[PDB]
Amino acid sequence: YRGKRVSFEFKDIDIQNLLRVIAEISKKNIVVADDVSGKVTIRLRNVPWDQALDLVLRTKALGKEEFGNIIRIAPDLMVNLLPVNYAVAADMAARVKDVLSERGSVTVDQRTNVLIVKDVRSNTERARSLVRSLDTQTPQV
């Protein structure tokens, strides 16, 4: 769960293809089962892959299990990184969980106090507006 930064753009492609593509980029050797799912659409910018993966899982796709050398996977939206300069990322977690409800979309907290969201643009926009708005009362030190 650490990698080079990437931008994932997938317009109506088999998750098996996204997976292989992700193995061809040295993001492990990835192998599915045979019939995992189908086709998905995502479009990410500035996301390390191992995250764009966790995030792909939550879209439609699978869960991942690693043997070590190989990993087995079994059965636009966008991603944007939000810097949080002023507040701690965990203090947002209550409010951010409360927008999601039983929706799709997710939020991931990286160690360097940045939030990452996959979702539809409309749920991304909401999550950014709240994260920045709560960050903004934190900049007045």
Added chain:
Amino acid sequence: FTLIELMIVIAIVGILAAVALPAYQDYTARAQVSEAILLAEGQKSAVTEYYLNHGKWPENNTSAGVASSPTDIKGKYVKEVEVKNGVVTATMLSSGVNNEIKGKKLSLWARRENGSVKWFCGQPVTRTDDDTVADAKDGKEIDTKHLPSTCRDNFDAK
């Protein structure tokens, strides 16, 4: 040949308990929350006075002049009550409560009316500035269904 009156009436009281189960289980939780609210209040006094006398919200319990220890303001279903910049939050214990409300909490916060203040009651909130708070969104918030009609206030209620 005969005995079905004893068999059905033992099985109607069994299903009666199953129907009476969720009613007593939210009436029950709704009752355990109504107290977190009572424990939260009565601490409005300290906080109100501190604010009106100094023009600044009490930073913590000790500032407000209350059990310097959050855990010292607990109850049966309340694991505590902390004052954080005038905002008073009540946490639900983990033992003796419903099931979907334990470890969950609410908040009471006030607003400068100028010469006095007005209090609000609702889901957890954080104070930003002396006259602004926000959803203490934690997913730890007591679910709207368990909150009285008098404690449905939103972070921006005026």
Added chain:
Amino acid sequence: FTLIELMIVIAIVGILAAVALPAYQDYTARAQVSEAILLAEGQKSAVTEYYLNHGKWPENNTSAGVASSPTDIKGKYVKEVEVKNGVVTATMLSSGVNNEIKGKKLSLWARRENGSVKWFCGQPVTRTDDDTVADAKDGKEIDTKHLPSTCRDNFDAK
């Protein structure tokens, strides 16, 4: 040759009453105790005030400012309610109650919180010092099974 539907169904309602007998008999007792508790409470007020105003627990009903006569604080299942050094004990009548709870009683006692007090509810207790009570072990305590979940307090509950 024939008539067994009338004979079995009269004998299933008979055995249904026998199965419904112990359920109504503890639900019943548990109900008669829930009142001894209500009669005991509401007298917390007098006792609390007396303590906070003087710093000493009311010695008896008259001190607490309540029906100077224990027997004057009785009920249907309650034969009385006596205040003995801040401890309020409720006695179950002998007529109109279960069978294993009559003449039996419980107690409500409080503890100095310093500036306020906290109340407990449970099996009979005696007060030792201003901040300590002990089991009035004697055999007339209402059995744990008949006491609410809110009245399971032990002599040393804090």
Added chain:
Amino acid sequence: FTLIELMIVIAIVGILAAVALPAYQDYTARAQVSEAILLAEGQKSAVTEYYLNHGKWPENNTSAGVASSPTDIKGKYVKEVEVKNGVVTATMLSSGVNNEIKGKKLSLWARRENGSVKWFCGQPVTRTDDDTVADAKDGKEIDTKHLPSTCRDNFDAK
């Protein structure tokens, strides 16, 4: 030559219904009265407050601050509930009830305890003075057999 199993078992269920007839018919009436009682109560509040605040029993529903119209406090088996000088009487409808309890009624009345009051429940009564009532002897009282164990109070109960 043969068929008596069908003939007897159809005639044992027939006689079983005849034996189950009076049981369901008083269980039933006793159930319809238990409500007249619930409709009568909950109006104790108004009456109690009126008395404690003024020291005089509410003359009628409007005084007590309840549906100014007796008929507005009716139910399924209850044709109404009237407050007459603190005494609250509940009348049994004429349709949807037993047979020996319709148009029949009971009363709830209280007594000055001095600082509070105690309530009674029983067969119809009239108020004489602020601390005395008497049997509204007239023939329309719900029969003792239909009244709960908790509503067997006599005009002079204290």
